[PDB]
Write a protein that binds this ligand. Structure first.
Ligand SMILES: Nc1ncnc2c1ncn2[C@@H]1O[C@H](COP(=O)(O)OP(=O)(O)OP(=O)(O)O)[C@@H](O)[C@H]1O
Ligand SMILES: [Sr+2]
Lengths: 139, 374
C-alpha cells in the first residue's frame, strides 16, 4: 500500500526496529513510518537540523529525531554520491543504543534504526539500497 | 580452529603484523619495505629475485634500494603494497587467500579511493571470500575491553587521537600528527652527532633505533629533569657499537621523546600529543566527553617510553576541567594493540555478519566499503 511497501519492506528481515520516509521538501512531512515508534514523530525543526546549512554543531551539541537524542557519527548527507549520515542514540539509565542511517534522495529522507547489536554498516547499506530505488524514480 | 580463522593483517608505516584470528600475538611481524637491487642482483640460492620484501630486505638494506609503500599511515604505492600482501600470505603465513576472510586495518581518516582500492585488490587480485577494513585505533580500544574512549595511537609515521563512541570512531574529531617513531630516531641521531658522534655506516643508522628504544625515557618535568641531568652520577648510560666503540648518552635519553610534547624541539609548529588528545575531546558530543577522559588509551610502538602514562596524565590533568576523573590506560601489551583487537573481533561469531562478501562486492562494486565499514 504505497510508500508503506518500502517501510514494511525495510522491516522484513528482523534487523531494524523503525523506518520512515519523510518529504523534507517545503513543510517536512512523514509519508510513511513504522507506526507508533520514534520517527512517526519527527518534526520540521529536526529535519531543518538534518538538512541544515550548518553542518557542524550537531557534533558537540547533538540532534534529536522524534524526541530521541542522537550523536552524529558520519555526515555525508549533503555530499554527492554519498547521501548518508550515520547516527547512534544516547542512553540514560543503562538502556541499549542503536545505529541510524538517514539517506537524502531527491525529495525524500529515508531513516532506519537497527535492533540492538546490529552494526552501523548493515543499516547503512540497507537504508542506502532502498533509497537508490527512490532516487532512480524521481523521488 | 586454525584452518579457518580470518587472517588479521595490520598495515603499519614501519611494521606489518599478520596472524590468525583467535590468537594472542602476531605470527609474522615484518619491516614495511620492498627493496630492489638497483644493480642486477641475485644470490645463487634464490631465483632472479629483484624485490626482497620485509626482513630479508632489512638484511641487505645496505646493498639495496628500499621503497616504503605505506606513508603517514596512507598507501602511496599500490603495486609495492600488492607485493607486501602477496608475501604476507604466500611466504609469511603460508596461506591461501581464497579460503580465509581478511580483516585489513586502515588509518583513521584514510582517503576514500584508498579504501576502495584495497577492497578492489583484495577481491579481484587475491579472490578473498570476504573482507573488512577496520580503523586501527578502534581495535586498540576493543582489545582493552572497551567500547567508548579515545585512543592515542603512535606508530612510526603518524599519531592520531581518535574519539570512539560505542565502537565507532568519530571522524570529525580525529586529529593527525605527523610526528611519530621515525621523527624520534632521527632527532636522537642529530643530537648524538651534535655531540661529535659518528653514525656513518648504513647498519649503524639503524643503531640509533636501538639506543632510542633502549635508553629513552619521558621526563615528568623536563625542566627539573634537565638539572637532574647536570646532577649527573646516574643518568649517563653507554651503548656499544658493532665497531667495538662506546657511546655515552645522558640528557639526550629524555630530550628525545620530549619532541612528542613540544614539537618545537623538532622545528614544528605542532601542538604536542597532550594537547591534541584534549582538542579531539573538545570536538566531540558534550555528553560523551566525560567518557573520553576516563578512557584515554595509548597504543603503538612510540607509546612504549617509560614515564609516558604519568606524563600524559599530568598534562591532561592540567588542561581538563578541575573535576574530570582522568584515567590514562596503558596496557603493557600496547606495541601490539591494533593486531590483538582485530584478532578478538574477527574471531567472534558476531563478526561473520559484518564482512563484505565476494557476493556483495559483485553486487555493488568497490564503493560498498563506505557503507559497511561504518
Ligand atoms: N620501547 C620502544 N620505545 C620507543 N619506540 C619504540 C619502542 N618499541 C617500538 N618503538 C617504535 O615504535 C615504532 C613502531 O610502532 P608501530 O608498530 O606502532 O608503528 P607502525 O604500525 O609501523 O606505524 P604507523 O601507525 O604510522 O602506521 C617504531 O618507530 C619503533 O622505533
Ligand atoms: Sr599502526
Amino acid at each position: 500500500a504505497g510508500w508503506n511497501a518500502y517501510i514494511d519492506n525495510l522491516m522484513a528481515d528482523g534487523t531494524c526496529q523503525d523506518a520512515a520516509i519523510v518529504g523534507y521538501k517545503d513543510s517536512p512531512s512523514v509519508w510513511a513510518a513504522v507506526p507508533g515508534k520514534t520517527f512517526v514523530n519527527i518534526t520540521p525543526a529536526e529535519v531543518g537540523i538534518l538538512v541544515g546549512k550548518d553542518r557542524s554543531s550537531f557534533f558537540v551539541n547533538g540532534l534529536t529525531l522524534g524526541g530521541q537524542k542522537c550523536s552524529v557519527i558520519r555526515d555525508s548527507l549533503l555530499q554527492d554520491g554519498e547521501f548518508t549520515m550515520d547516527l547512534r542514540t544516547k542512553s540514560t539509565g543503562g538502556a541499549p543504543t542503536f545505529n541510524i542511517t538517514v539517506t537524502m534522495t531527491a525529495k525524500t529522507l529515508v531513516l532506519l534504526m537497527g535492533k540492538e547489536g546490529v552494526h552501523g554498516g548493515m543499516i547503512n547499506k540497507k537504508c542506502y539500497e532502498m533509497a537508490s530505488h527512490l532516487r532512480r524514480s524521481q523521488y | 580452529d586454525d584452518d579457518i580463522a580470518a587472517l588479521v593483517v595490520d598495515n603499519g608505516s614501519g611494521m606489518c603484523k599478520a596472524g590468525f584470528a583467535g590468537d594472542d600475538a602476531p605470527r609474522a611481524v615484518f619491516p614495511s619495505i620492498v627493496g630492489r637491487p638497483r644493480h642486477q642482483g641475485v644470490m645463487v640460492g634464490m631465483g632472479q629475485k629483484d624485490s626482497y620484501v620485509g626482513d630479508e630486505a632489512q638484511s641487505k638494506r645496505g646493498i639495496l634500494t628500499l621503497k616504503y609503500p605505506i606513508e603517514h599511515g596512507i598507501v602511496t604505492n599500490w603495486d609495492d603494497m600488492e607485493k607486501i600482501w602477496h608475501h604476507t600470505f604466500y611466504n609469511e603465513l603460508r596461506v591461501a587467500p581464497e579460503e580465509h576472510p581478511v580483516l585489513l586495518t586502515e588509518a583513521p581518516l584514510n582517503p576514500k579511493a584508498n579504501r576502495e582500492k584495497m577492497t578492489q585488490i583484495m577481491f579481484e587480485t587475491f579472490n578473498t571470500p570476504a573482507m573488512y577494513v577496520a580503523i586501527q585505533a578502534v581495535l586498540s580500544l576493543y582489545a582493552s575491553g572497551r567500547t567508548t574512549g579515545i585512543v592515542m595511537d603512535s606508530g612510526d609515521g603518524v599519531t592520531h587521537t581518535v574519539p570512539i563512541y560505542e565502537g565507532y570512531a568519530l571522524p570529525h574529531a580525529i586529529l593527525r600528527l605527523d610526528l611519530a617513531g621515525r621523527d624520534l630516531t632521527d632527532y636522537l641521531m642529530k643530537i648524538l652527532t651534535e655531540r661529535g658522534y659518528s653514525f656513518t655506516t648504513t647498519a649503524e643508522r639503524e643503531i640509533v633505533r636501538d639506543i632510542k628504544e633502549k635508553l629513552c625515557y619521558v621526563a615528568l618535568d623536563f625542566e627539573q629533569e634537565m638539572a637532574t641531568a647536570a646532577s649527573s652520577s646516574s643518568l649517563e648510560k653507554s651503548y656499544e657499537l658493532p665497531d667495538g666503540q662506546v657511546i655515552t648518552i645522558g640528557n639526550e635519553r629524555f630530550r628525545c621523546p620530549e619532541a612528542l610534547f613540544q614539537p618545537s624541539f623538532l622545528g614544528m609548529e605542532s601542538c604536542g600529543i597532550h594537547e591534541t588528545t584534549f582538542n579531539s575531546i573538545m570536538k566531540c558530543d558534550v555528553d560523551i566527553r566525560k567518557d573520553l577522559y576516563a578512557n584515554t588509551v595509548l597504543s603503538g610502538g612510540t607509546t612504549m617510553y617509560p614515564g609516558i602514562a604519568d606524563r600524559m596524565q599530568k598534562e591532561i590533568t592540567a588542561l581538563a576541567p578541575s573535576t574530570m576523573k582522568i584515567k590514562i590506560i596503558a596496557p603493557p601489551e600496547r606495541k601490539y594493540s591494533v593486531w590483538i583487537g582485530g584478532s578478538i573481533l574477527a574471531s567472534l561469531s558476531t563478526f561473520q555478519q559484518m564482512w563484505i562478501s565476494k557476493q556483495e562486492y559483485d553486487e555493488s562494486g568497490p564503493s560498498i566499503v563506505h557503507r559497511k565499514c561504518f
